[PDB]
Design a binder for this molecule. Structure first.
Ligand code: HEM
Ligand code: HEM
Ligand code: HEM
Ligand code: HEM
Ligand code: HEM
Ligand code: HEM
Ligand SMILES: [Ca+2]
Ligand SMILES: [Ca+2]
Ligand SMILES: [Ca+2]
Ligand SMILES: [Ca+2]
Ligand SMILES: [Ca+2]
Ligand SMILES: [Ca+2]
Lengths: 156, 157, 156, 156, 157, 156
């Protein structure tokens, strides 16, 4: 629909959680964003179906930086209240993947890898309580899947 | 893309976790599946782009019961070592939604709703330790997204 | 209850009228079949009770067309002398509604909507005489109800 | 499903036509009510399937008269603005047939017989204009079907 | 005509026989009542002056079962010493037929059909002696006709 | 109906039995007809409801003879094949009772008294076998009730 309609959805999704979850998510992600980019592309490059669209060269010189930026954007949206900008960036990214025919199932898997690795990182935070750590993991899955849904509008 | 091939992916994804996460996840899912189906279709019926594809009759007499069996299938797979049947079922399910042109992002949102609600139930289990609940929640996200990935193979062509 | 038996009833019902009524009805129905299905499904979709059994997807991609073919089949039966096939189609259609428990009074109401609209269209026909348009309306209601009766065997 | 609710539907249905159609229909129906019940029960009694639910005693001493009053009630409703009472009577009538399992397709067929005969009688009316007789037939079918729909609520 | 008064007539008519005729009659009737009802309505449905009053629906859903209970009532009366209830029931039944103007001679014919068929069954009982069968047959005619007499009080006015 | 139609009914009713039953019935009745008349009117005269229409005088001078004649007629019909005459006599007798308003229930009781007494007489015949005695009692009830039914046509 409208990027104004989508911005509301994002904000509604994040509004289920307190700013404390937004911040814990955004901190663990900004501290580990390069290692999250590493983990993502080493998963992709190892799948011959996905390494069809990837190369070790294209990762180290472009996608690795693009992925870090994408992580920062996803997790700064609610803290900054920059909902309309992030949803526009998501539709731009989604449009790049549909144009070159990236299988949507591989986009789904990549989101799943990010969710898993962030949540494992949150688990070892120790500076978070158990309930705070659990609420934040649920927010991580929520907001990453929201971002991917925006991206996947380009496939319909 | 053989189901024996895809079955290796389901099994590797589950093998990242101990059977104790498989079982904990399966018990909360199997005990709340009707509640989980309710949550799934009241989300969809709330969004008019997804309401387009649904009727109250269709949900009540078919999809509500089909959602519970889908949940049963996903969470029985690793404990029953029945990866190959489960992947053939997910592939067949995804082929039903692509044939009627259900937008893939709506399937994603549905997945997201299920993962959220199951992890909320896991969070109030009390019989799970903090560490066990968090590992079971990561399994729930992994295995549900793997299942949805198998469904969305039907959207590649 | 054999299809050969019910076809007798269909044939007798239509033999009350001449071929000119069959042809005038079939003509107005074929020139207006999409609009008749439009009117049919806008009535059904606006009543919450009936809208309970319909998704807008089902209407647009399946029923809007199936209704057109149903109308075509009903008004071709007597002119093509295809009585036995038509009644067998009507019975199977009736069975689809009983199987999912479409309330029969909604099926009645829908038949009534088709009759009213077809007869309104027949009244605007300037190429037909007064007495011809009246006999044709009488036939329209007769053949439409006849088809609904066969659909309604499935509910006993 | 309240009688107040269904009366809305009856009122809306009749408001599609003017009082002149209500009165012309009511007039032809009242001058011909015994003959209409004659035609109704001779059709039903000659079909063995329907004759299964009827004794000739029941027809002569009860139903031949009850059918006359049913016709009177249906065509008085809009002219007497008695919508709520009429729909409550229709519902109770419908319940008598469901209780003894009168097949609904026979009820449909009987409605169709009444519509055809009333509209034939309307076509022979020399005191009515062409366009008036056509609008009146359209109303006859509408109000007759409306009554049968209310009878048919009992079958769901 | 009080039912206590009429009850004396039923009881005197039965007292002409021993309880062994009451019991023998009741057992053959109670064991064949569905068969007896069948015989009753295929007679009536065969005569067009009586078919006038009947529909296949009415027989199948109502009168077939009402005929068996009537048979039960008539043959339970003397053994249960419930004369007064039985006469009030017969009076109420006859009032239903006179109200719809069932010709009284048709009721008589129905009685005649029942008495014939029950006495034919009594005749092939084998566990009754010749003398016992004949006494039980005379009771069957007596008690069935007494019952029909109570019914036809409704035709006096 | 027609006395020709009724004569057939009588003959059909008697045709269920062999001439041997007709003859055994007709013999025991002709040998005891005065004692059967006695038993009948001593039952009637003892009921004040029935002795309302009777007197000891009217019995000994008329009805007693009329009753014997009636018994002979009923039991000679099938042996003589005089079906049409007996049914005409039955309607004449029935017409006398309806004209003076004899309660039909007392006519029923009187037939029952005759049936009982004849069957008791047959039981002690000894010149009849058991099966022959049983078939004849069933014929006695059959033909007496047939006669009374004819008589009771006058009440409808
Ligand atoms: C959650 C999943 C994913 C995220 C967040 C993501 C992120 C991004 C971003 C931010 C860009 C840059 C867009 C731009 O500069 O306009 C991009 C481009 C690209 N992505 Fe993705 N991506 C995902 C999944 C995938 C997958 C599964 C593949 C499989 C090969 C893939 C292959 C590529 C390629 C080849 C480009 C370069 C496009 C070009 O240079 O023309 N991505 N991605
Ligand atoms: C992860 C998300 C979903 C899951 C697990 C799921 C599960 C299922 C299952 C198990 C069936 C029955 C398959 C069969 O008939 O063999 C089904 C059918 C169906 N689903 Fe879903 N579904 C999902 C998303 C959706 C969404 C988002 C929509 C609509 C907005 C939708 C609409 C339908 C419809 C209309 C059918 C039936 C098609 C028919 O009966 O012809 N589904 N789904
Ligand atoms: C005049 C009355 C009606 C006519 C002539 C009619 C016509 C038809 C026909 C021809 C089909 C066959 C579709 C197929 O087999 O491919 C169908 C199916 C169906 N109709 Fe109707 N219809 C009537 C009334 C209604 C009403 C009142 C409802 C609901 C309010 C309804 C809902 C449906 C549904 C749910 C299906 C099943 C579609 C599916 O799942 O395949 N119909 N109708
Ligand atoms: C247009 C359709 C029909 C109409 C308007 C209609 C009218 C009526 C009405 C008003 C009554 C009420 C009698 C009362 O309550 O006193 C009634 C009862 C009844 N009707 Fe219909 N009828 C229709 C169809 C049929 C059909 C098709 C049958 C059988 C083939 C049937 C058989 C009966 C029966 C058995 C009763 C019950 C009478 C009783 O035992 O009291 N009707 N009808
Ligand atoms: C000895 C002969 C008969 C017996 C024992 C008998 C018995 C009964 C009984 C027990 C009932 C139900 C009473 C009630 O509803 O409370 C009944 C009703 C009825 N009987 Fe008979 N019956 C006899 C003769 C007949 C005959 C000869 C006819 C028609 C030719 C007839 C027609 C009916 C009808 C139409 C009803 C129902 C009236 C209604 O439902 O409104 N009966 N009978
Ligand atoms: C099976 C039962 C009955 C039979 C066979 C029978 C026989 C007859 C016969 C043959 C006649 C002469 C008719 C004639 O000459 O035209 C007659 C007349 C008469 N019967 Fe009956 N009857 C029966 C029941 C009753 C009952 C219950 C009463 C109750 C009082 C009664 C009172 C009379 C009377 C008073 C007459 C004389 C009519 C007159 O003289 O004007 N009968 N009956
Ligand atoms: Ca922790
Ligand atoms: Ca916990
Ligand atoms: Ca015109
Ligand atoms: Ca005219
Ligand atoms: Ca024996
Ligand atoms: Ca003997």
């Amino acid at each position: 629909p409208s990027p104004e309609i989508l911005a509301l959805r994002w904000k509604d999704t994040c509004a289920h959680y307190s700013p404390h979850e937004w911040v814990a998510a955004r901190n663990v992600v900004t501290a580990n964003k390069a290692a999250l980019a590493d983990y993502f592309y080493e998963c992709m490059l190892a799948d011959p179906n996905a390494a069809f669209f990837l190369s070790d060269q294209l990762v180290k010189t472009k996608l690795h930086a693009s992925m870090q930026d994408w992580l920062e954007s996803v997790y700064a949206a609610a803290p900054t209240e920059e909902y309309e900008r992030t949803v526009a960036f998501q539709r731009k990214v989604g449009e790049v993947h549909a144009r070159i025919d990236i299988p949507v199932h591989l986009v789904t898997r990549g989101a799943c890898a990010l969710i898993r690795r962030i949540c494992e990182l949150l688990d070892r935070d120790a500076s978070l309580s158990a309930a705070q750590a659990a609420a934040t993991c649920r927010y991580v899955a929520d907001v990453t899947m929201t971002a991917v849904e925006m991206m996947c509008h380009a496939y319909s």
